[PDB]
Amino acid sequence: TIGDEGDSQLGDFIEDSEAVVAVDAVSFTLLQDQLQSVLETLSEREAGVVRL
């Protein structure tokens, strides 16, 4: 216990470096809806190689 009181703890202020950030979770999906969906559909079989 830290803070001159028995209320707070050493561990309350641990910032998580792994916590998911919503914006990125959105952004990637948009990229998946912008890269794979639109730009791919411009060269038919020539773009098909990029898929594999």
């Binding site: 914006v23 959105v26 952004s27 948009l30 912008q34």
Partner: protein
Amino acid sequence: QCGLPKLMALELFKPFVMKRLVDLNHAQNIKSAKRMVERQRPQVWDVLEEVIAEHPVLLNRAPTLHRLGIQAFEPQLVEGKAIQLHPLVCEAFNADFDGDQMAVHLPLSAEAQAEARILMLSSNNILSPASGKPLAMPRLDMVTGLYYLTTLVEGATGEYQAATKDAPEQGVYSSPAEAIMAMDRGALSVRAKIKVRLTELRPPTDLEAQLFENGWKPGDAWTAETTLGRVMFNELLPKSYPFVNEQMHKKVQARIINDLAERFPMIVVAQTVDKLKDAGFYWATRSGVTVSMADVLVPPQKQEILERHEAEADAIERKYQRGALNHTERNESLVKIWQDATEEVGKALEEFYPADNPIITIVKSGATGNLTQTRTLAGMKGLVTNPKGEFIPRPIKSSFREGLTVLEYFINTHGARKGLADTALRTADSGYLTRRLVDVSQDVIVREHDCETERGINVTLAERGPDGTLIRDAHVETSAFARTLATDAVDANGNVIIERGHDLGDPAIDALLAAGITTVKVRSVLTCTSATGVCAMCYGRSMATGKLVDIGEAVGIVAAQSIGEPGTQLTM
């Protein structure tokens, strides 16, 4: 309405801002809009304004005591980094602008937004739930304006002079506009009595009978004897409200608002209080209230009162040296003598100060303060209490205007420090009490409309002696008002004045008093028989709406919070 800083509002609405920015082609993707908002690009405010509007936000102060401590407001941008709060809701929040801080929350879900603007909207919570009386009313300077505006003073310019041998009536104006023009010209004082023709204001209830027995309508002109200030004040109230013609001070305004709430919708009361706020501030700005040394008068007779009391004090002091009285008896005698002196000086003060003195004008109008503080400031402080609570025999002959001595000031600090140090313990005790009351009564909920029981409880409406008159009881407000009659109200004749199941209100209270009956049966939650929780009809009309409670009301929390509201005000 409430004002929010630009930066706080922008960063807090960031997601909606990005959505709208990308919608209006300002950004090609979400990340671009995010980066644009990060540096607050100029071309986003036009989107933020249409985003912020119509989106309620909850405002809250700490500590929270009653449910009015959280309220929904409609935000509007304001320059700066501080939140602008409406002056009326401060009393509801118990907030003061000597440095309080407030938190803001944003409802996201559609259900939450509907709750915020229907249930929690600030304009829909004027009535205090504790007693069903209005809490958003003018206070402090707001009253001092309406007071000064409506006060009538004789010996002014532009008065109403009756017809004489050589001259006709002088102070008669064809309309309020002419009176306003005269006031601008400097010929008519606002507080001077006049006779004016009023065509848009309904006449008083009694005056109506002899003038428009058929019925008053807009445009029906009548003649009123009143000051211009009262005429201006009465146009703030709804047109249907009859002319009042009284000197407005705290209790009169409370009466007017109480009458308005009962017979008008909620929106009308909100608009009326807003208009009253505007007028009160505008006219308090010009009332001239101010403090100065020569303004705080000192009673001339003090040198006589204290000199006279000196003989009695010396008499007691010398009577103690002979062992004819106990030490405690001598202390009690001195305490009584100095209490008499303090009362004498206080009444001499209230005799001496003129009517329109700023200090006495502030105190008497009910805006704030009390007469004892004025007595302490001007007359003298008097006796004080030591740490143990005993009354120190030596009084404080000086006053805070005259200039206290060193030792009087030293001995004055005991009680001041004790009272200052008691507040934290009072708050802690009140918090514990509220916790326990909330814990015990947390499953008292209105589950069914009516339990259909006849077992009520007796209540008294009128007090009288063996010989005298019937007068409304001293605690009708807390016991009888806002109930439901369990059984019909029948007098000694047999005719039913009020049928069973009827709501009880001030009109009904007066009607029952007109019937000359003293006691009646009212339904109660003590006798309520529903298996689960309670029923609406036994609880009575909701304090927060003035109407019958609806199913699902969490009456238990309301009761606990109402009981715990005066946590720090029950000082022995």
